[PDB]
Design a protein around this nucleic acid. Structure first.
Length: 50
DNA sequence: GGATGTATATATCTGACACGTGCCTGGAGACTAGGGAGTAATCCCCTTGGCGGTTAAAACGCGGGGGACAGCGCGTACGTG
């Protein structure tokens, strides 16, 4: 993913781990990026490697 | 025996150089003020990398026909003496 694309409607339920290669200046973009996979109904424990 | 081509010596031209001279303009020395270098603050404009959405402009393909170009004639206007 490019971090600032796709809006808030991207559904990524099947993924488990999120790796942030480049840290954003705005942390809310990173929170939205990790909430792409941490949506309601996720069946796995999500970890983020920065 | 008369006439002809070449070789060293002296007078004259001719630009360049040594010397003379004026004078005026550039250089040496001193002083000063101000123009520019440096510093700090503030705020607006520009840079590089991204995103989203509109949409009008750009790209591509194809028919066809108008125009560029080649060939030929001619007669006149310009070259030449």
């Amino acid at each position: 993913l490019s971090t600032r694309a796709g809006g808030l409607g991207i559904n990524l339920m099947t993924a488990d781990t999120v790796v942030i290669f480049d840290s954003d200046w705005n942390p809310q973009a990173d929170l939205q990026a990790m909430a792409r996979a941490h949506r309601i109904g996720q069946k796995n424990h999500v970890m983020v490697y920065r």
